[PDB]
């Protein structure tokens, strides 16, 4: 029962068993229809946590490796590669759901932006640990997805919509952390932040909490990047 | 938590420290 | 597929990356090569499984609390909790296996025997907490008996300020109070351990100072809370 | 150490609470 995968997910969330949560929402997604906004939020939180645990581990192992003997430095690399291969499996799973179910079934323009952003993200996460030819593919595919979302975001949503704001936040991180373009990063973020200030008026009760957090984050990032 | 701003600052700072 | 030095050291890396399942799998493997364990190794082992088991116990309590809130909605709290319960019984049985086949059988010096006997009490304690009435009498009784035997050895062969002796008293007291609902016992057990340790606070070894005082503070934390 | 002790208290407290 779908309504039931869904409450397995909610339970797994509460218990902090994010791998269970993701596999449930993956099964819901494979049932082929458009996701409710609540199902879509659960899927996204599930996988953000599942991939973030691994990226965090990957970062820890990598920090240790620089900090450093050979037999040890080698097991550092082997353990990182075990983490890398889980990251690739997590992200491929999500990008396949995006490619086959969520982006094709995405009718409302705010859905297509959300999922194209999600594809930019998971291709960004692949890029953070990719090598050589495959890095260029991942980085290119992440920018394509972000940009396609960032053009629909301007034609269909206001500068205060939390999905438009989140896309600007994450695209700015892509420029800063993946393309290594601090200036393109800091401008994308400032613009989106100023554009939403100059129309704070517009924030429906329902959007207020989320959009303000994202603008706080956009400003926290800009503050940090001018340091 | 809504340790979100803190955890995000920690995350963005990592890239700065560990990729100069 | 590798060597003690190698596995021990992916165990440390797994710890820092907080991948405790990886960490416990690493130390299970070093345990099975049968070679008896450093203090360093024994502790990485204990830490790995305490976190592995601890995650499932925390999750079980979360899911339990929620079941205390639809014939099939609650049918799922029940199915999910039982998924966790099964994970938790598997973890405990894997650790119980290693204890009975490898660690207790080679426990040469009394420090080690007490340590692993406590673990046996600990992991039968955790089985008891979700155990199904049939076993629950047996996991309790296994738990008390592992603990009592560690208790006996530790009173005769270790200082009141040894951190292993104190941690055992901490967990045995917890066992009385939370498994055998005998606060009078648990409380008396925790008081005597704290009291006999502080009495010998002039020969508390420097090496042990941080751990033994932490455990003494937790005994005091739990005595205070068990009297509220 | 404060972290350790407070996690312990939360853990022991859950018992006095959710199964009294
Ligand atoms: O903590 C982080 C950044 O670090 C990460 C850690 C784990 C997974 C992904 C990421 P990211 O895509 O690179 O940002 N929060 C940023 C995401 C966010 C958006 C809106 C509201 C709240 C938070
Ligand atoms: O956090 C807890 C209690 O709760 C748990 C949580 C996870 C797994 C097991 C347990 P426990 O065996 O029932 O006590 N610390 C108590 C044990 C301790 C001894 C010495 C130093 C520090 C702590």
Author numbering:
A (entry chain A): 4 to 71, 74 to 232
B (entry chain B), D (entry chain I): 117 to 136
C (entry chain F): 2 to 70, 74 to 232
What does the paper say about this structure?
The PPI of 14-3-3 with the carbohydrate-response element-binding protein (ChREBP) regulates transcription of glucose-responsive genes. Whereas most of the 14-3-3 clients require to be phosphorylated prior to 14-3-3 binding, ChREBP is one of the very few phosphorylation-independent 14-3-3 partner proteins21–23 and interacts with 14-3-3 in a unique α-helical conformation (residues 117–137). Whereas phosphate- and phosphonate-containing moieties thus generally compete with 14-3-3 target binding, for the 14-3-3/ChREBP complex the phospho-binding pocket is uniquely positioned at the rim of the interface, presenting an opportunity for phosphate-/phosphonate-based PPI stabilization. Small-molecule stabilizers of the ChREBP/14-3-3 protein complex are identified that indeed engage a composite interface pocket constituted by both protein partners.
The tertiary co-crystal structure of 14-3-3β bound to 3 and the ChREBP peptide was solved by X-ray crystallography. The overall complex resembles the previously reported crystal structures for a 14-3-3β dimer with the two antiparallel-binding ChREBP-α2 helices. 3 was indeed found clearly positioned in the phospho-accepting pocket of 14-3-3, interacting with R128 of ChREBP, and K51, R58, R129, and Y130 of 14-3-3. A relevant, additional intramolecular polar interaction was observed for 3 between its amide nitrogen and a phosphonate oxygen, stabilizing its protein-bound state geometry. The phenyl of 3 on one side faces an ensemble of hydrophobic residues of both ChREBP (I120) and 14-3-3 (L218, I219, L174, and L222). R128 of ChREBP ‘bridges’ between E182 of 14-3-3 and the phosphonate group of 3 by engaging in polar interactions with both. The crystal structure compared with the docking pose for 3 revealed a different orientation of its phosphonate, which is rotated around its tetrahedral geometry (by ~109.5°) with the phenylphosphonate group pointing outward of the 14-3-3 central groove (crystal) versus into it (docking). This directs the orientation of the rest of the molecule in the crystal structure, resulting in optimal nestling in the 14-3-3/ChREBP interface pocket, with the second phenyl beneficially engaging the hydrophobic roof of the groove.
